Each structure stands twice: as structure tokens, then as C-alpha cells.
Amino acid sequence: IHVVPKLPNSKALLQNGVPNILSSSGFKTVWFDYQRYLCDKLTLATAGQSLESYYPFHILLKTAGNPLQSNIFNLASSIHNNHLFVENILPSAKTEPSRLFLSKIKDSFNGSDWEVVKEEMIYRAENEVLGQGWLFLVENNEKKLFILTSNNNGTPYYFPRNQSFDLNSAISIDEFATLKQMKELIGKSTKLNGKVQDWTMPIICVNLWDHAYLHDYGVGNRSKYVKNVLDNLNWSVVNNRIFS
Amino acid sequence: DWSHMLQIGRPLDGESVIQRTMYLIKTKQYGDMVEAYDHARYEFYALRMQEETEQQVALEEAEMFG
Amino acid sequence: PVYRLPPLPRLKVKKPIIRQEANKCLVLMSNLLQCWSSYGHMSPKCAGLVTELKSCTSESALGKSNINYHAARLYDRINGKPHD
Amino acid sequence: TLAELLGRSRIAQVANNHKPLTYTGKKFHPTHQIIETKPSTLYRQEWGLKSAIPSKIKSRYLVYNDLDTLERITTFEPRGGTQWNRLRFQEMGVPINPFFKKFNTEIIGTGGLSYSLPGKLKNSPNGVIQRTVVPGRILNVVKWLAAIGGFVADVVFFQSPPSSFNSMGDFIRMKTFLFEILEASMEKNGSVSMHARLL
Amino acid sequence: TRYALEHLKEGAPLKGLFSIEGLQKAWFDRVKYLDAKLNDCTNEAQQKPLETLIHENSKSASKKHIVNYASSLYNLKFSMSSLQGCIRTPPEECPRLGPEALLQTPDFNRTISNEPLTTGNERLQAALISSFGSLMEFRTLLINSNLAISGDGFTWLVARRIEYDKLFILNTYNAGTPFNFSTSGVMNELNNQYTNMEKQRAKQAKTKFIYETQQKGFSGKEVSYIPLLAIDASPKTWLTDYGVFGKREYLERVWDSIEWKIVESRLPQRT
Amino acid sequence: PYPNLIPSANDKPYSSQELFLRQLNHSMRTAKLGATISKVYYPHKDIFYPPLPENITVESLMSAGVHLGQSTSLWRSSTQSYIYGEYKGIHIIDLNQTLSYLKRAAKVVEGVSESGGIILFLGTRQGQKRGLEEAAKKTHGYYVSTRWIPGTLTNSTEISGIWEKQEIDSNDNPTERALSPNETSKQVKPDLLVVLNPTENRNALLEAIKSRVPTIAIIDTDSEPSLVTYPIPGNDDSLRSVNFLLGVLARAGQRGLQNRLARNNE
Amino acid sequence: KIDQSLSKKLPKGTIYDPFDFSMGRIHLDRKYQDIMKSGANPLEFYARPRILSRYVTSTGRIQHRDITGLSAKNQRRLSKAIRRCQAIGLM
Numbered sequence A: 001i002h003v004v005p006k007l008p009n010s011k012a013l014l015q016n017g018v019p020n021i022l023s024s025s026g027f028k029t030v031w032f033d034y035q036r037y038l039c040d041k042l043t044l045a046t047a048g049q050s051l052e053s054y055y056p057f058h059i060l061l062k063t064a065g066n067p068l069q070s071n072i073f074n075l076a077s078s079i080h081n082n083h084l085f086v087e088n089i090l091p092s093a094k095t096e097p098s099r100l101f102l103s104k105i106k107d108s109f110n111g112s113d114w115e116v117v118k119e120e121m122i123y124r125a126e127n128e129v130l131g132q133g134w135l136f137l138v139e140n141n142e143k144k145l146f147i148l149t150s151n152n153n154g155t156p157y158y159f160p161r162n163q164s165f166d167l168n169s170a171i172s173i174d175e176f177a178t179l180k181q182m183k184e185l186i187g188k189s190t191k192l193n194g195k196v197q198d199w200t201m202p203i204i205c206v207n208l209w210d211h212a213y214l215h216d217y218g219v220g221n222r223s224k225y226v227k228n229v230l231d232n233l234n235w236s237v238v239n240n241r242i243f244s
Numbered sequence B: 001d002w003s004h005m006l007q008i009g010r011p012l013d014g015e016s017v018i019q020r021t022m023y024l025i026k027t028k029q030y031g032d033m034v035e036a037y038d039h040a041r042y043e044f045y046a047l048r049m050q051e052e053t054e055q056q057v058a059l060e061e062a063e064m065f066g
Numbered sequence C: 001p002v003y004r005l006p007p008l009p010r011l012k013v014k015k016p017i018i019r020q021e022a023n024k025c026l027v028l029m030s031n032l033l034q035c036w037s038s039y040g041h042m043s044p045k046c047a048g049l050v051t052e053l054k055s056c057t058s059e060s061a062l063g064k065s066n067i068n069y070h071a072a073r074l075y076d077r078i079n080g081k082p083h084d
Numbered sequence D: 001t002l003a004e005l006l007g008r009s010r011i012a013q014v015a016n017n018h019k020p021l022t023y024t025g026k027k028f029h030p031t032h033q034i035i036e037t038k039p040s041t042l043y044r045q046e047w048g049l050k051s052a053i054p055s056k057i058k059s060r061y062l063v064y065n066d067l068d069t070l071e072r073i074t075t076f077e078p079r080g081g082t083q084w085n086r087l088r089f090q091e092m093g094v095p096i097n098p099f100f101k102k103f104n105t106e107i108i109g110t111g112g113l114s115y116s117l118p119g120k121l122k123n124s125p126n127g128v129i130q131r132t133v134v135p136g137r138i139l140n141v142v143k144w145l146a147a148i149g150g151f152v153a154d155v156v157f158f159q160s161p162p163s164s165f166n167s168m169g170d171f172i173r174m175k176t177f178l179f180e181i182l183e184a185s186m187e188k189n190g191s192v193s194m195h196a197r198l199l
Numbered sequence E: 001t002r003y004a005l006e007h008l009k010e011g012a013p014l015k016g017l018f019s020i021e022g023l024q025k026a027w028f029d030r031v032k033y034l035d036a037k038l039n040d041c042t043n044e045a046q047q048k049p050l051e052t053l054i055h056e057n058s059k060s061a062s063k064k065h066i067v068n069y070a071s072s073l074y075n076l077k078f079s080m081s082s083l084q085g086c087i088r089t090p091p092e093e094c095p096r097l098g099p100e101a102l103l104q105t106p107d108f109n110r111t112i113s114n115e116p117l118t119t120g121n122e123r124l125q126a127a128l129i130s131s132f133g134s135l136m137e138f139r140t141l142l143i144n145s146n147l148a149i150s151g152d153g154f155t156w157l158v159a160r161r162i163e164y165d166k167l168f169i170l171n172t173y174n175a176g177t178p179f180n181f182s183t184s185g186v187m188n189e190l191n192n193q194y195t196n197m198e199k200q201r202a203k204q205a206k207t208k209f210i211y212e213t214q215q216k217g218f219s220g221k222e223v224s225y226i227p228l229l230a231i232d233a234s235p236k237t238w239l240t241d242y243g244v245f246g247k248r249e250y251l252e253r254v255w256d257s258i259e260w261k262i263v264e265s266r267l268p269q270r271t
Numbered sequence F: 001p002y003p004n005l006i007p008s009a010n011d012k013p014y015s016s017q018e019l020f021l022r023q024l025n026h027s028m029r030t031a032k033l034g035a036t037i038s039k040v041y042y043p044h045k046d047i048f049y050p051p052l053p054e055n056i057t058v059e060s061l062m063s064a065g066v067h068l069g070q071s072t073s074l075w076r077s078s079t080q081s082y083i084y085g086e087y088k089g090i091h092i093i094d095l096n097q098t099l100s101y102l103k104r105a106a107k108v109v110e111g112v113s114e115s116g117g118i119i120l121f122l123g124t125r126q127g128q129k130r131g132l133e134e135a136a137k138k139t140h141g142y143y144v145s146t147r148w149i150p151g152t153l154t155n156s157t158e159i160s161g162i163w164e165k166q167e168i169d170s171n172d173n174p175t176e177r178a179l180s181p182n183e184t185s186k187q188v189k190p191d192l193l194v195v196l197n198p199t200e201n202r203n204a205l206l207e208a209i210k211s212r213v214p215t216i217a218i219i220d221t222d223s224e225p226s227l228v229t230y231p232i233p234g235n236d237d238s239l240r241s242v243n244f245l246l247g248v249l250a251r252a253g254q255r256g257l258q259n260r261l262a263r264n265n266e
Numbered sequence G: 001k002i003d004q005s006l007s008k009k010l011p012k013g014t015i016y017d018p019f020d021f022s023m024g025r026i027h028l029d030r031k032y033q034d035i036m037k038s039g040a041n042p043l044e045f046y047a048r049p050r051i052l053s054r055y056v057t058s059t060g061r062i063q064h065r066d067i068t069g070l071s072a073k074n075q076r077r078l079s080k081a082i083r084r085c086q087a088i089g090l091m
């Protein structure tokens, strides 16, 4: 039985929700209703199996390579990502960005400062993520940050399941080349499961699903919601997520 | 509560069908064993069809999104 | 039908039979001899086989049953004797 | 009471089955329930059965007949193959209605193999999947039969067999081919008769 | 403009399916935003119809947004066009379904409502029985397919190729196209072009046989589909009113809200 | 924290050990996000978080598989009174009798530990070492899991006389006093012996009988109840049931030890 | 070519596992390689030399119950019927 995690200051979040991003009704939709929905669906899908004993992150890491249980993976991914998202918008466990994170953004993004990087992430979310999706700021094994976007329920950890390219429409030839090299990397591995190593981790997570913003911000104006999320993050969690 | 087949913390299996059959007979919603067994069987078929469709559609979506 | 043996002092095979695999050199020699029997000695047809033999025996001319142990180990468990 | 709980216990949930574990006859459908144990319980040889399974077993699936016997052994087999066949059928996508509206023992429609409905097609990034292709192995030099994804089917040819067949002879099963599943039907006894075409 | 439909009005509801706010947000705000983006990306979309835009602007990464927004608007219009409403109680008045909805079992294998033939749509129901076994099976398959869509998407009824040989049910995701000739062969095209590049600067042959096979057909290599009906799985339509747990309630009310005369009008004759 | 580790330069990528520490930091903080697992059985907890004797229900004993007895073909008819019935070719143990006997044996273990007696946990099946060791450590007792040397009690001088002994206070604190050779060569006899597999340890049971050592054991359907002072009807061939009962007894012993220390610290 | 005994033939419509395409499967199959078992009276088959001849060797020796696999009752009736057939001039 997967159960919705308890959140600090739950009474205040019920009363008002996350300040300056969501109202109480919106926070109910994004977390109290959607997280319960996802957890119940995962429990129904994985009950009576081994996967009931593993956490959603270990579930999605286990299930990433098997086509026929993608649904479980999707649920697991959401159940993880949503919580990550919530944790970077919780009022508290004003928090300030750390020196190390600022240095990494400055070094990772070709000298660009953090705020223009925020605007660039807003642009990326507006452009590529058509409809439901997730936005992440992630660090790779080279100690380099970069911006990743996943369509529907995708994971930053495993690059085969990043779901960063929307094939329903066309794809740029460069995106096709990226897909082909990715598939070659997958195929090179000698493991029977076909697994590959990916040490990417999410430092920032933003929920672009309609549950997050539609009730508070409408069909349009999603970039407004993303800007509000990024401006008022809980920087203690974000700083802790980085390793030194 | 066995008014419905799906239980949280339980898989969806044939034993759920037998449990729903016994619940139906106990409440006397149906009289004969065969009738309740058939009704639970049809609920089982509906639920399993829904799960099969979720799996197929999920795999198709995954391939759709790269 | 099932036959149940009495409580026996032991459970052992007198002569365990092992599947030694016939040496490759011997069978290759036999094939060569049959070749020269049918086509003739130093016949063009099967001369290739000769090459194989020349290699197969070049280094050397010719190039285990645990049933009793396991039976003795397991007999007390599987004999199905009455309690005491 | 204890009797009620024993009636609702998972060991009781497994139906009484006593068929030979090692069966050399024709196999059309599963005959034993597959018992699964988590890796943590496998580490301690706990399978939910009466007694601990020997530590030699490394697989997480088995099929069993007796919880205990006179020989003090659990009558089991470390095999969980059949599920894969079922799952492999789901990869084929070929659909096969009794599932829509005194006790009868006939196999009801597809007995859990596939609960899909015929009228759907697969979208792919290349486009609509018109015809489903899966790899298989032609078995014998005979119609010709093929082992395709856990099931034996009779392959419908297209003009002549490729010359590779005649060259290889009885070593034909060594080489993989690509087939398209024309149709899948279920016979009364539970056999799944599929017709495929060698491309 | 052609985007807006006459059976929808600002400040007026669609009985049973949407409230005033639900219809507002789902349709009028969505079309406003979508047409704004579409006209911003290209001013020429005003002159040309959506289908012509989709056909002409496909297969180009630079012109992607044009096809994306054209398909979104066209599919939204196609989905809402078949709607008529239903006698069931207003969604606003009914208390929202909660977690219990997940545990309730569907009745889509033991019930049938809003059958086309009762209204007089005999040919449509005959064809659905012909290709999908029965309307019980058709309704189950359609609603299960649209339920399974995680995010933004549509479930389509389609007919093959004006006359059809056979009917089918399709899914499209984040502004996909129901017809197939716009996108068919794109991956094979890019694969061949990429191999030509890579050699200019065999797994490809084995994969190409399968590529051609997946879309190869009998009597022709190119396959087309007539849209006939569309449902919307996007949270935009149903999250506002029914809530997180109320997608199944939305889909059943949608099914009761289908008028099959409009669907028959789209039916392309017969082989 | 992690001495003798040489971090990498910012220009260069992470090292394998740096990646390991990074993933450990991720695991201890964020890997467990999304849901909290409830009502799921984790085997290790049966050793580390055993329930108290009073909190045990029949449902908990049945979940551990304690009720599953031997095959009906291997029945020892002297165990008739402990049997609830037979089902699927095996005898079912009456779990209410099991609960009563287990509570009594737990009280015995708690009393013996509270008196400062020596408690010996003997179990020689394959995977029983972990639970035996943990029970002995938390009861300040002793255990054997490799093999019971015959004559360990009746011939203690020739078996256990060479190993070293130790004087300790009321609080189990080493005194480090020098023991005389005669004191070192005396027999030290267990005050309580608990056997997980009494069928394969007849020698230990007979030695305890001869040496007047009260003994507890898990009495399966094919085991003799009268060979032990405090039988516990239950399944002895499943590691889960054995570990559950052993953890209950070990927690009772730990409670007795804690009571003893609390009284000595007042 | 492969001798037929060395090859395993999967029948049509039967499921299989990868183990089936193995010599172990052939060896296992080798290892585990009518009317009178249907509740009939063998004494009634005393003027029917063919069906009686099904249960004798080439020389006419009655086959043991280990070979026939019949019940003791039907085995005795079969022996009696075969001997009666021998006596009356048939068989």
C-alpha cells in the first residue's frame, strides 16, 4: 500500500496552499488529489507483485527497461516527480540561493547568470512541452548543469526514458541523430536487461501538468506559473540536493 | 469491502472473483452460486480489459514520446 | 504401482555407470579408415579428412559418479521410515 | 476464527492442482500456478510455502504440487516460463465475445491469455502500424511450422521457400526469420492456432 | 470564425457534460489562446483551412508550431462537433467523484446506452457491429482507450482508404493527426537521409525491411484514414468540473452526449 | 566521515567514489520520495523489530506461517491435541494453543533473563544463524548454529573446559578479575535452552534432560512434545515462522534484562 | 543431416520454452516415454481372437499385468478368456 507522504505545515497548506504560486484549491488539486490518485493507481497496479515493496524511485529505476509495464513506470515517475516538485515549492522545511549553485550555473551555462537562465527555462517550457509535462534542472556526471524537459510522465535519471522529444509531430534531423546515438548507447551494453548507467540527478523540478496551474492560471499563461514557481522556490531543499 | 472487486493492498486475481461471489451470496443479492459467480466473472472481465488497455496505451505513448 | 522398500542398512549402487565420451581421435581414425576402405587408400575424395587427423593427434595420440554419495546423504530424509 | 482465516489464506487461494509437474505431452496452456517470491524473501529461502526451498534455487518463480510429502521434500519445479509466453503474446498485438454478457468446465473464450478487443491499431512514430512483424524460427523441413515468441504456428508462404531453407535442411531452426501474424484463433481444447507469413 | 461552433455559446452550458465555467475554459479560452499562437507563428493560416495547413506544413521542424496548433484546434473542433449533451444531471450540481471512483468497477461489458440505431443511425451501428463485434465492445474499447491516455490526447473513430473497407479506433497525442498520409514514412525518410549524411562525412537494411513492412499494405503502399468521431482525454476539458478522479464520469457522459447523425454524415459510403 | 578520500578538481568529471558518495547523498534524502510504504512485510524486521508477547494475535502468527504443520503421512500421533485439522495434505497447528504456549515460554525466557541465568539458543538449520546471533546478543545470551557437539553438557570438561570464562557484576559489566584454574575449569551450564529444530537435535534435548536444564522448543507435527519442558506448537521448517517466534522470545529476554538493569540502577 | 531421434518436433499450436530446443528435452521425453481398461468384460471377448491377440506376445504367451497394466480382476478375466479361446479351437 503506497500512501501519500505527509507534508510539513500540512494545515497551513490546506488553509492557503503554497504562497505566491498556488491557492488552497490549486494545491489540493496538485498534491492532495493528484498524489492520492497516483498512489492509489500505483498500489492497484503493483499490489500482489514484488514492486509493492519498493519505493517509487526504485520502482521506476527497476521498470524503465521493460516495455509492457510502462504504465507502472509512468505512475511511479509522476509519484516521484510530483513530490520533488512540491518540495521545491514548500514554504519551508527567506531562503537564498547558495554560492555553490550560483557558481555551477555560471560555469555550466557558459557564464550566464541565474536569472537569464530562469528566463531560458521559461522559454524552453513554453516551446517544447506542449500540454502535460515536467521541467527539470539536472546535473550530469561532469558536474555540468543543464535544462531538461519531459513530455507527460518522464524521468530525468534514465536517458532512454527522458521523453524529451515529441515524435507525434515532426523532429529536427539533429533530434533524430540524438535519438540514434542514444539507441546505439543502449544497444552497446552487454547486460541482458539492456540497462545503461546514467548518473543524472534533478536539482530543480517544475510540474507543467494541468493539475498544477489550470485552476489558478487558466488554459494559457503557463509560463506565468513557471516564472512564479522559479522565483519563490525553497532554496534549502535545492541546495541540499546538490552534492559537494 | 466486497461491494466492489478492487481492493487497495490487494492484487486483482481470481480469488477476488470468488470473494465477490461469496459476498453476493451472503447479502442474497443473487440466490444461486452460478449467478453470483457469473456476475463476478463479468466484473473481472471488465476490469482486466481496462488494465490491458492501460498497458497497451502506455507502451504506445512511451514510443510516441521518444 | 508404487513399491516401498523396507528400512535398509544402506542405499548404494554396486556399479555406478559413467558416460565416458569416446575420444575424438579414435572416431576420426575410424572415419579415415572407412574413407580409405570405400574410395581407396590415398584417395582424392577424403584426403581432406586426413589433414584433420594430422592436426587432431599432432600434440597427443588421444588428446566420477556421485550417486552413492548423494543417496547415502539423503536416505535418512527420503526413506519415509516411521517415527520414534 | 482460525478456519475462516485459513480459508482466506494465500496458500488456500492456490487451487488444488495435482497434475504431473514434468509433462512430456502436448502443452496448450498453463497447468500450474506460478508462485513468485520477492528477492528479499528469496535471500532467506522464504516462498510463503510450508518449508524453506533449498538455497540452490536462484530463480524467483516455481510451480508446485505438494506443500509437504512423505519424503520430507516440497514437490516443486523452479520454472516460471509460461507467463513470458503470455506476456510475449501481448507484444505481438494480434487480437483474438464470451467476456460480454450447473458449472461448466470448458475454457471460456481466451482463458486469460488476451483480454484485448479486435478493433484497434498501433500508432508508431513512423506512422500507423498496418501489419505487425515479429521474429521467429522455422523449425522443420516439411505446412511449415515456426516457433514464434513462445507459440508454435503454421506459416503461410508467399511463392517459394527461400533457398536458405533447402541449403540448411534440418539446421533451419538456427536462423531467425521475420514473420507477420495473419490471424490468431483459439480452438476448443485451448490451443492457440496462429497463421503467419514469412516475409 | 470557423473555429467557433453554433451549438456553443459564451455564458451558456452544454447540458450534462460541461457547466458554464467548464465550457468556457475548455472551449472559448482554449480556442482564443490556440488561435493567438497559430496566427502569431504564421499569419497565412487565416486564409487556409486547418486540414490544408496540416497537409502543407508537415514534415518540417521549422514549421512545426503551425502544424501543432492547427492540429490542436482542428481536433478540438472535431471532438466538440459531435456533442449534443445528455439528459443526466448537470455536472455542476453533482458532488465531485472522489477516490472511491478508482475502486468502482465499470459496467461497460454489461450495459449499452445511446445506441446509434435508436435515433435512426442504422448504417453506423451496422458497420460498428460488422468491424467491432458489437456496440458493447466498441463503447468499451473507445472509453478504455481514451481513459488510458495519461495526458493530452484524443481517441478517434476512423475508416480506411470515397469509400471505406474497414473501421478502426485510433489514438493521437499532443496535436497528432488522425489521418496517416501526413506522417507515414517519416522515420524511414530520416533514417535513409541520416545514413547518406553519415557516409558522406547492415543494421539499416534489416531494419528497413521491417520499416517498410509496418506501413506496407495490400493493393498499395500508402494508407489513409477518414476521421469520424473524436473524444478529448486532455485534463483541460474535465479537470475543471469533474476533478482528478472524475475522468470516467466525464467519458460516460461524453458517450451519452454523442449525436451519431453527425458521425454518419462523415461516414464515407462503403466498399 | 570519509577519511583518506581525495576529491577531484572542478574542471574534471566526478570520480567513481565521488559518484558513489553523490548517489548515497541522493539515496538518503530524495530516493525515498513519492510515497510511504505501509502494510508490507520486510523479512529483516522480524529479527530487529519483534512484537511483544502481549501484542501477538492469531492473525500475526498465521501470517508468519506458524500454523503450517508437517505432512499427514509423517504425523506423530502424540501431537494430536495441538492440531486444528488437516488441509491440502498437511496438518494445521491450532494457533490459539500456539499463542498460549508462546506467551508462557516468553514469560519463562523473560524470568530467566531477569534472574541473570544463561540462555542458549540452539538452531542448526541453514539460514538460522542471523536470528540466533541477534537473539543471543539482545538477551546477553549465547547461541550455537554450526553443530551441537554431543556431550557438551554431560561431558563439559572434555568439550567446553578449555575456553575462557569471565566474572561480571550485576550490571553485566566486566570486572577483569583473574580467575583461578579450578574456577575456569568448572562446568558452566545453561539455565535455559531453546531449540529451533528439536527433531534434528535429540542429543541436546537428552543432555538437557540428564543435566536438568529446562528447555523450550518449536514442536512441529512430527516432533515429540514431551521431550521438552515448554513446547511451542508451530512450524519449524519455515524460516519466517522460526524467526518470528525466536524474535518474540528474544524480546521477552531483552525486557527481562532491561528490568534487571533498571532495578540494579536504583 | 540430423537424425530424427536427435531432433525435437514441437507440435502445432503448442506452447514451448527455450529449453525445448535442447538435447535435455529429448532425453527427458525419452525417459518418460484399451477396450479392457474401459469397464468391459474380457470374458465376453472370448470368441474375438483379434482383441485377445492384442494382449499376447508373438508366440502367444499371455502378457504380465506389469505389461498390460490391467486390473487384477480384468487381468484374470483376460487370462481366462485367452485360455478359453485356445481351448475352443479359436486363436
Ligand SMILES: [Mg+2]
Pocket: F070, F199, F220, F236, F237
Ligand atoms: Mg519440521
